[PDB]
Structures are given as C-alpha cells and as structure tokens.
C-alpha cells in the first residue's frame, strides 16, 4: 500500500506499550 506510514509507526514503538489500556 505505502511505506510512508510504516516508516513512522516504527518510531511509534510505544503503541506496543498500548497493551496497558486493556
């Protein structure tokens, strides 16, 4: 689809930390 967004989410590795929401 587009590697322009996958490059940023890499910097946003915190979203993994997001498991603390549930």
Swiss-Prot record:
Glycans are attached at residue 13. It is a single-pass type I membrane protein. It comes from the Viruses. It is found in: Virion membrane; Host cell membrane; Host endosome membrane. Residues 1-22 are annotated as: MPER. Acts as a class I viral fusion protein. Under the current model, the protein has at least 3 conformational states: pre-fusion native state, pre-hairpin intermediate state, and post-fusion hairpin state. During fusion of viral and target intracellular membranes, the coiled coil regions (heptad repeats) assume a trimer-of-hairpins structure, positioning the fusion peptide in close proximity to the C-terminal region of the ectodomain. The formation of this structure appears to drive apposition and subsequent fusion of viral and target cell membranes. The mature envelope protein (Env) consists of a homotrimer of non-covalently associated gp120-gp41 heterodimers. The resulting complex protrudes from the virus surface as a spike. There seems to be as few as 10 spikes on the average virion. This is Transmembrane protein gp41. It comes from Human immunodeficiency virus type 1 group M subtype B (isolate HXB2). The lineage of its organism: Viruses, Riboviria, Pararnavirae, Artverviricota, Revtraviricetes. The gene is env.
């Amino acid at each position: 689809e587009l590697d322009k967004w996958a490059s940023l989410w890499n910097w946003f590795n915190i979203t993994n930390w997001l498991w603390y929401i549930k």
